[PDB]
Amino acid sequence: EKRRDNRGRILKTGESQRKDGRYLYKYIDSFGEPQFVYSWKLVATDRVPAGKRDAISLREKIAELQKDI
DNA sequence: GAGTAGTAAATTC
DNA sequence: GAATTTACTACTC
């Protein structure tokens, strides 16, 4: 069973979407307290409704959490 | 640990 | 000027 985004792609565990359609990636840090990461573009290729603050794709943020900073 | 819904505060075109 | 985003928790499995 694999959930998908508001389109037809495939989101991996840990990733998901809130009620605003924006993507949301929750992940328990080595502290024991869930962490919220928000974004609108799943990959640095999509766009973002005018009025929203530009940002890298959540995939670019996750990459930082996997590396170090 | 994974996810949702709801909120508290500050910010933007 | 108005509307909007971010962050954490509470409960759930």
GROMACS .gro file of N, CA and C (backbone and C1' of nucleotides) in nm:
model
  387
    1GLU      N    1   0.086  -0.122   0.000
    1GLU     CA    2   0.000   0.000   0.000
    1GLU      C    3   0.088   0.125   0.000
    2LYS      N    4   0.069   0.212  -0.096
    2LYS     CA    5   0.151   0.338  -0.102
    2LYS      C    6   0.055   0.456  -0.123
    3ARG      N    7   0.062   0.555  -0.039
    3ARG     CA    8  -0.026   0.673  -0.056
    3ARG      C    9   0.031   0.760  -0.168
    4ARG      N   10  -0.044   0.857  -0.215
    4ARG     CA   11   0.007   0.945  -0.325
    4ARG      C   12  -0.017   1.092  -0.288
    5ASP      N   13   0.033   1.182  -0.368
    5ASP     CA   14   0.012   1.327  -0.340
    5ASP      C   15  -0.124   1.368  -0.397
    6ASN      N   16  -0.147   1.496  -0.410
    6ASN     CA   17  -0.277   1.542  -0.466
    6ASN      C   18  -0.279   1.520  -0.617
    7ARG      N   19  -0.171   1.469  -0.671
    7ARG     CA   20  -0.163   1.444  -0.819
    7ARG      C   21  -0.178   1.294  -0.847
    8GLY      N   22  -0.071   1.229  -0.885
    8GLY     CA   23  -0.077   1.083  -0.914
    8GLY      C   24   0.061   1.022  -0.893
    9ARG      N   25   0.148   1.093  -0.827
    9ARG     CA   26   0.285   1.041  -0.802
    9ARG      C   27   0.282   0.949  -0.680
   10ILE      N   28   0.396   0.919  -0.623
   10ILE     CA   29   0.401   0.828  -0.503
   10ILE      C   30   0.486   0.892  -0.393
   11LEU      N   31   0.428   0.917  -0.279
   11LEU     CA   32   0.505   0.977  -0.166
   11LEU      C   33   0.565   0.864  -0.083
   12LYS      N   34   0.684   0.881  -0.031
   12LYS     CA   35   0.745   0.771   0.052
   12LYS      C   36   0.704   0.791   0.198
   13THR      N   37   0.713   0.687   0.278
   13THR     CA   38   0.674   0.700   0.422
   13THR      C   39   0.736   0.826   0.481
   14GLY      N   40   0.687   0.871   0.593
   14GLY     CA   41   0.743   0.994   0.655
   14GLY      C   42   0.689   1.117   0.582
   15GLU      N   43   0.671   1.109   0.453
   15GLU     CA   44   0.619   1.226   0.376
   15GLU      C   45   0.467   1.219   0.365
   16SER      N   46   0.404   1.331   0.341
   16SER     CA   47   0.256   1.333   0.329
   16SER      C   48   0.211   1.475   0.292
   17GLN      N   49   0.085   1.506   0.309
   17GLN     CA   50   0.036   1.643   0.275
   17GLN      C   51  -0.069   1.685   0.378
   18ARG      N   52  -0.068   1.810   0.417
   18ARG     CA   53  -0.167   1.857   0.519
   18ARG      C   54  -0.299   1.894   0.451
   19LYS      N   55  -0.374   1.982   0.512
   19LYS     CA   56  -0.506   2.023   0.454
   19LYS      C   57  -0.486   2.138   0.355
   20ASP      N   58  -0.376   2.208   0.364
   20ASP     CA   59  -0.352   2.323   0.271
   20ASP      C   60  -0.294   2.272   0.139
   21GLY      N   61  -0.283   2.143   0.122
   21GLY     CA   62  -0.227   2.089  -0.005
   21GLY      C   63  -0.074   2.095  -0.001
   22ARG      N   64  -0.019   2.175   0.085
   22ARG     CA   65   0.130   2.184   0.093
   22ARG      C   66   0.185   2.052   0.146
   23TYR      N   67   0.306   2.018   0.111
   23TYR     CA   68   0.363   1.889   0.158
   23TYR      C   69   0.407   1.902   0.304
   24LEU      N   70   0.408   1.792   0.375
   24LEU     CA   71   0.448   1.792   0.518
   24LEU      C   72   0.529   1.665   0.545
   25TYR      N   73   0.648   1.679   0.598
   25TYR     CA   74   0.734   1.561   0.628
   25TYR      C   75   0.763   1.557   0.778
   26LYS      N   76   0.700   1.465   0.847
   26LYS     CA   77   0.720   1.453   0.995
   26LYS      C   78   0.828   1.346   1.020
   27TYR      N   79   0.918   1.370   1.110
   27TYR     CA   80   1.024   1.268   1.138
   27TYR      C   81   1.075   1.283   1.281
   28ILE      N   82   1.079   1.175   1.354
   28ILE     CA   83   1.125   1.180   1.495
   28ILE      C   84   1.277   1.200   1.498
   29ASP      N   85   1.322   1.308   1.557
   29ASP     CA   86   1.469   1.335   1.562
   29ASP      C   87   1.532   1.254   1.676
   30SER      N   88   1.662   1.256   1.685
   30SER     CA   89   1.732   1.179   1.793
   30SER      C   90   1.698   1.237   1.930
   31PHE      N   91   1.602   1.325   1.938
   31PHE     CA   92   1.565   1.385   2.070
   31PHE      C   93   1.441   1.313   2.125
   32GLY      N   94   1.357   1.264   2.037
   32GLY     CA   95   1.233   1.193   2.081
   32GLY      C   96   1.114   1.288   2.070
   33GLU      N   97   1.122   1.383   1.979
   33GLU     CA   98   1.010   1.481   1.961
   33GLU      C   99   0.988   1.501   1.809
   34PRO      N  100   0.874   1.464   1.755
   34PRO     CA  101   0.847   1.481   1.609
   34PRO      C  102   0.894   1.618   1.557
   35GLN      N  103   0.929   1.626   1.431
   35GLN     CA  104   0.978   1.755   1.372
   35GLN      C  105   0.897   1.786   1.245
   36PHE      N  106   0.851   1.908   1.231
   36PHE     CA  107   0.769   1.946   1.111
   36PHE      C  108   0.854   2.016   1.004
   37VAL      N  109   0.838   1.975   0.880
   37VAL     CA  110   0.910   2.042   0.767
   37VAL      C  111   0.804   2.075   0.661
   38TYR      N  112   0.784   2.201   0.630
   38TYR     CA  113   0.678   2.240   0.532
   38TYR      C  114   0.738   2.275   0.396
   39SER      N  115   0.656   2.271   0.294
   39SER     CA  116   0.704   2.305   0.156
   39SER      C  117   0.587   2.294   0.058
   40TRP      N  118   0.604   2.340  -0.064
   40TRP     CA  119   0.494   2.333  -0.165
   40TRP      C  120   0.540   2.247  -0.283
   41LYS      N  121   0.666   2.254  -0.316
   41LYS     CA  122   0.719   2.175  -0.432
   41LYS      C  123   0.776   2.042  -0.382
   42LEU      N  124   0.733   1.932  -0.437
   42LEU     CA  125   0.788   1.801  -0.392
   42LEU      C  126   0.931   1.789  -0.445
   43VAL      N  127   0.955   1.843  -0.561
   43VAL     CA  128   1.093   1.839  -0.620
   43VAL      C  129   1.122   1.977  -0.678
   44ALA      N  130   1.246   2.014  -0.686
   44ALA     CA  131   1.278   2.149  -0.738
   44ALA      C  132   1.247   2.157  -0.887
   45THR      N  133   1.121   2.146  -0.921
   45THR     CA  134   1.079   2.155  -1.063
   45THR      C  135   0.936   2.209  -1.069
   46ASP      N  136   0.857   2.180  -0.970
   46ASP     CA  137   0.717   2.228  -0.967
   46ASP      C  138   0.714   2.380  -0.949
   47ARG      N  139   0.600   2.435  -0.912
   47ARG     CA  140   0.587   2.583  -0.892
   47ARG      C  141   0.522   2.609  -0.756
   48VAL      N  142   0.466   2.726  -0.735
   48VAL     CA  143   0.400   2.756  -0.604
   48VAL      C  144   0.297   2.869  -0.624
   49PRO      N  145   0.171   2.848  -0.588
   49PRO     CA  146   0.067   2.954  -0.603
   49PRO      C  147   0.117   3.092  -0.560
   50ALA      N  148   0.093   3.190  -0.641
   50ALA     CA  149   0.138   3.328  -0.606
   50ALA      C  150   0.091   3.362  -0.465
   51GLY      N  151   0.168   3.440  -0.393
   51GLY     CA  152   0.129   3.478  -0.253
   51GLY      C  153   0.202   3.386  -0.155
   52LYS      N  154   0.248   3.273  -0.201
   52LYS     CA  155   0.320   3.178  -0.111
   52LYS      C  156   0.469   3.215  -0.108
   53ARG      N  157   0.537   3.182  -0.001
   53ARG     CA  158   0.682   3.215   0.008
   53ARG      C  159   0.763   3.110  -0.069
   54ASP      N  160   0.846   3.153  -0.160
   54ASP     CA  161   0.927   3.056  -0.238
   54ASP      C  162   1.008   2.968  -0.143
   55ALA      N  163   1.045   2.851  -0.187
   55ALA     CA  164   1.125   2.760  -0.099
   55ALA      C  165   1.178   2.645  -0.183
   56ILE      N  166   1.281   2.579  -0.138
   56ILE     CA  167   1.333   2.464  -0.216
   56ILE      C  168   1.231   2.353  -0.205
   57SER      N  169   1.248   2.248  -0.279
   57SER     CA  170   1.152   2.136  -0.271
   57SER      C  171   1.179   2.057  -0.144
   58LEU      N  172   1.076   2.011  -0.078
   58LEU     CA  173   1.096   1.934   0.048
   58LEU      C  174   1.208   1.832   0.029
   59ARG      N  175   1.221   1.779  -0.090
   59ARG     CA  176   1.327   1.679  -0.117
   59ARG      C  177   1.464   1.742  -0.093
   60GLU      N  178   1.476   1.870  -0.113
   60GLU     CA  179   1.606   1.937  -0.090
   60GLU      C  180   1.625   1.952   0.061
   61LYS      N  181   1.517   1.977   0.132
   61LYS     CA  182   1.527   1.990   0.280
   61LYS      C  183   1.561   1.854   0.339
   62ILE      N  184   1.483   1.754   0.307
   62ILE     CA  185   1.511   1.617   0.360
   62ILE      C  186   1.660   1.585   0.336
   63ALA      N  187   1.709   1.618   0.220
   63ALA     CA  188   1.852   1.591   0.189
   63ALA      C  189   1.941   1.655   0.297
   64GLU      N  190   1.901   1.768   0.350
   64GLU     CA  191   1.985   1.834   0.454
   64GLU      C  192   1.975   1.755   0.585
   65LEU      N  193   1.858   1.706   0.615
   65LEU     CA  194   1.840   1.629   0.741
   65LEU      C  195   1.915   1.496   0.732
   66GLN      N  196   1.930   1.443   0.613
   66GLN     CA  197   2.002   1.314   0.598
   66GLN      C  198   2.153   1.340   0.604
   67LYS      N  199   2.197   1.448   0.547
   67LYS     CA  200   2.343   1.479   0.549
   67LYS      C  201   2.383   1.527   0.688
   68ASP      N  202   2.385   1.656   0.711
   68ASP     CA  203   2.424   1.707   0.846
   68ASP      C  204   2.367   1.847   0.868
   69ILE      N  205   2.379   1.933   0.770
   69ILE     CA  206   2.327   2.072   0.786
   69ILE      C  207   2.285   2.127   0.649
   70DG     O5'  208   1.074   0.742   1.634
   70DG     C5'  209   1.113   0.680   1.511
   70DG     C4'  210   0.999   0.597   1.451
   70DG     C3'  211   0.906   0.678   1.359
   70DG     O3'  212   0.916   0.634   1.224
   70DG     C1'  213   0.779   0.550   1.523
   71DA       P  214   0.869   0.729   1.103
   71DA     O5'  215   0.710   0.700   1.094
   71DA     C5'  216   0.659   0.606   1.000
   71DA     C4'  217   0.515   0.638   0.960
   71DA     C3'  218   0.499   0.782   0.909
   71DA     O3'  219   0.435   0.781   0.780
   71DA     C1'  220   0.360   0.745   1.105
   72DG       P  221   0.384   0.917   0.709
   72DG     O5'  222   0.251   0.953   0.794
   72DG     C5'  223   0.139   0.864   0.795
   72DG     C4'  224   0.011   0.938   0.837
   72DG     C3'  225   0.013   1.085   0.793
   72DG     O3'  226  -0.102   1.113   0.712
   72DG     C1'  227  -0.026   1.068   1.032
   73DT       P  228  -0.134   1.263   0.662
   73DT     O5'  229  -0.262   1.302   0.750
   73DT     C5'  230  -0.349   1.200   0.801
   73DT     C4'  231  -0.453   1.256   0.899
   73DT     C3'  232  -0.491   1.401   0.868
   73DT     O3'  233  -0.630   1.409   0.831
   73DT     C1'  234  -0.419   1.379   1.100
   74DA       P  235  -0.698   1.552   0.801
   74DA     O5'  236  -0.714   1.616   0.948
   74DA     C5'  237  -0.817   1.572   1.036
   74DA     C4'  238  -0.825   1.659   1.163
   74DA     C3'  239  -0.841   1.808   1.130
   74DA     O3'  240  -0.963   1.858   1.187
   74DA     C1'  241  -0.649   1.772   1.275
   75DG       P  242  -1.001   2.015   1.178
   75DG     O5'  243  -0.913   2.080   1.296
   75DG     C5'  244  -0.930   2.036   1.431
   75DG     C4'  245  -0.849   2.122   1.530
   75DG     C3'  246  -0.843   2.270   1.487
   75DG     O3'  247  -0.914   2.353   1.579
   75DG     C1'  248  -0.620   2.183   1.536
   76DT       P  249  -0.916   2.513   1.560
   76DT     O5'  250  -0.775   2.558   1.626
   76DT     C5'  251  -0.760   2.561   1.768
   76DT     C4'  252  -0.611   2.561   1.809
   76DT     C3'  253  -0.551   2.702   1.816
   76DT     O3'  254  -0.537   2.745   1.952
   76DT     C1'  255  -0.403   2.548   1.699
   77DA       P  256  -0.480   2.892   1.985
   77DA     O5'  257  -0.321   2.870   1.985
   77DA     C5'  258  -0.244   2.885   2.105
   77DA     C4'  259  -0.109   2.952   2.076
   77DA     C3'  260  -0.123   3.103   2.051
   77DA     O3'  261  -0.047   3.178   2.146
   77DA     C1'  262  -0.022   2.990   1.858
   78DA       P  263  -0.031   3.338   2.131
   78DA     O5'  264   0.075   3.351   2.010
   78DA     C5'  265   0.214   3.325   2.032
   78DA     C4'  266   0.297   3.338   1.903
   78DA     C3'  267   0.295   3.480   1.846
   78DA     O3'  268   0.420   3.546   1.870
   78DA     C1'  269   0.254   3.313   1.672
   79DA       P  270   0.449   3.691   1.806
   79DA     O5'  271   0.483   3.655   1.653
   79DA     C5'  272   0.609   3.599   1.617
   79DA     C4'  273   0.629   3.593   1.465
   79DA     C3'  274   0.643   3.732   1.403
   79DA     O3'  275   0.770   3.745   1.338
   79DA     C1'  276   0.461   3.608   1.298
   80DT       P  277   0.804   3.875   1.247
   80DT     O5'  278   0.748   3.831   1.102
   80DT     C5'  279   0.773   3.700   1.051
   80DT     C4'  280   0.713   3.679   0.912
   80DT     C3'  281   0.724   3.804   0.823
   80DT     O3'  282   0.813   3.780   0.713
   80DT     C1'  283   0.496   3.716   0.823
   81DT       P  284   0.837   3.893   0.602
   81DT     O5'  285   0.720   3.863   0.495
   81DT     C5'  286   0.718   3.741   0.422
   81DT     C4'  287   0.606   3.739   0.317
   81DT     C3'  288   0.620   3.854   0.216
   81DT     O3'  289   0.647   3.803   0.085
   81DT     C1'  290   0.399   3.855   0.319
   82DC       P  291   0.707   3.900  -0.029
   82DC     O5'  292   0.577   3.938  -0.116
   82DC     C5'  293   0.515   3.840  -0.199
   82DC     C4'  294   0.377   3.887  -0.248
   82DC     C3'  295   0.388   4.001  -0.350
   82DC     O3'  296   0.347   3.957  -0.479
   82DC     C1'  297   0.239   4.062  -0.165
   83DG     O5'  298  -0.462   4.932   0.590
   83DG     C5'  299  -0.582   4.952   0.514
   83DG     C4'  300  -0.621   4.826   0.437
   83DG     C3'  301  -0.641   4.705   0.530
   83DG     O3'  302  -0.777   4.659   0.524
   83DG     C1'  303  -0.471   4.657   0.361
   84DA       P  304  -0.828   4.543   0.623
   84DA     O5'  305  -0.797   4.409   0.538
   84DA     C5'  306  -0.847   4.394   0.405
   84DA     C4'  307  -0.804   4.261   0.344
   84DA     C3'  308  -0.849   4.141   0.429
   84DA     O3'  309  -0.932   4.053   0.352
   84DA     C1'  310  -0.606   4.143   0.403
   85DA       P  311  -0.982   3.912   0.412
   85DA     O5'  312  -0.854   3.817   0.387
   85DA     C5'  313  -0.803   3.797   0.255
   85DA     C4'  314  -0.668   3.723   0.255
   85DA     C3'  315  -0.678   3.585   0.322
   85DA     O3'  316  -0.649   3.482   0.225
   85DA     C1'  317  -0.491   3.712   0.412
   86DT       P  318  -0.629   3.328   0.270
   86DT     O5'  319  -0.475   3.325   0.316
   86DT     C5'  320  -0.373   3.383   0.235
   86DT     C4'  321  -0.232   3.356   0.289
   86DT     C3'  322  -0.219   3.216   0.351
   86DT     O3'  323  -0.131   3.134   0.274
   86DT     C1'  324  -0.134   3.387   0.503
   87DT       P  325  -0.101   2.983   0.321
   87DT     O5'  326   0.035   2.999   0.405
   87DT     C5'  327   0.159   3.026   0.340
   87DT     C4'  328   0.275   3.035   0.440
   87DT     C3'  329   0.306   2.899   0.504
   87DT     O3'  330   0.437   2.854   0.467
   87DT     C1'  331   0.261   3.067   0.675
   88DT       P  332   0.497   2.718   0.528
   88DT     O5'  333   0.537   2.762   0.678
   88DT     C5'  334   0.665   2.820   0.705
   88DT     C4'  335   0.686   2.846   0.855
   88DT     C3'  336   0.707   2.716   0.933
   88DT     O3'  337   0.839   2.711   0.988
   88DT     C1'  338   0.528   2.849   1.033
   89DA       P  339   0.887   2.583   1.075
   89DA     O5'  340   0.808   2.603   1.214
   89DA     C5'  341   0.880   2.629   1.335
   89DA     C4'  342   0.803   2.582   1.459
   89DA     C3'  343   0.806   2.429   1.474
   89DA     O3'  344   0.879   2.392   1.592
   89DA     C1'  345   0.576   2.512   1.478
   90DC       P  346   0.889   2.238   1.637
   90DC     O5'  347   0.752   2.215   1.718
   90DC     C5'  348   0.723   2.294   1.833
   90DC     C4'  349   0.611   2.232   1.918
   90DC     C3'  350   0.621   2.079   1.923
   90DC     O3'  351   0.649   2.035   2.056
   90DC     C1'  352   0.401   2.149   1.843
   91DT       P  353   0.636   1.879   2.098
   91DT     O5'  354   0.484   1.870   2.150
   91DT     C5'  355   0.423   1.982   2.215
   91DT     C4'  356   0.270   1.973   2.216
   91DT     C3'  357   0.220   1.835   2.259
   91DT     O3'  358   0.151   1.845   2.385
   91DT     C1'  359   0.112   1.907   2.052
   92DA       P  360   0.083   1.714   2.451
   92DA     O5'  361  -0.047   1.693   2.359
   92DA     C5'  362  -0.174   1.745   2.399
   92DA     C4'  363  -0.289   1.662   2.342
   92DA     C3'  364  -0.277   1.513   2.378
   92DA     O3'  365  -0.388   1.470   2.458
   92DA     C1'  366  -0.286   1.544   2.136
   93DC       P  367  -0.407   1.315   2.496
   93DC     O5'  368  -0.451   1.250   2.355
   93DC     C5'  369  -0.587   1.257   2.312
   93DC     C4'  370  -0.609   1.191   2.174
   93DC     C3'  371  -0.578   1.040   2.176
   93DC     O3'  372  -0.697   0.964   2.155
   93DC     C1'  373  -0.466   1.150   1.990
   94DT       P  374  -0.691   0.803   2.147
   94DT     O5'  375  -0.644   0.777   1.996
   94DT     C5'  376  -0.726   0.819   1.886
   94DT     C4'  377  -0.664   0.781   1.751
   94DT     C3'  378  -0.624   0.633   1.744
   94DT     O3'  379  -0.705   0.562   1.650
   94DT     C1'  380  -0.441   0.777   1.671
   95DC       P  381  -0.689   0.403   1.632
   95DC     O5'  382  -0.540   0.388   1.573
   95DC     C5'  383  -0.518   0.382   1.431
   95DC     C4'  384  -0.403   0.287   1.395
   95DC     C3'  385  -0.404   0.160   1.482
   95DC     O3'  386  -0.431   0.045   1.402
   95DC     C1'  387  -0.185   0.269   1.487
   0.00000   0.00000   0.00000
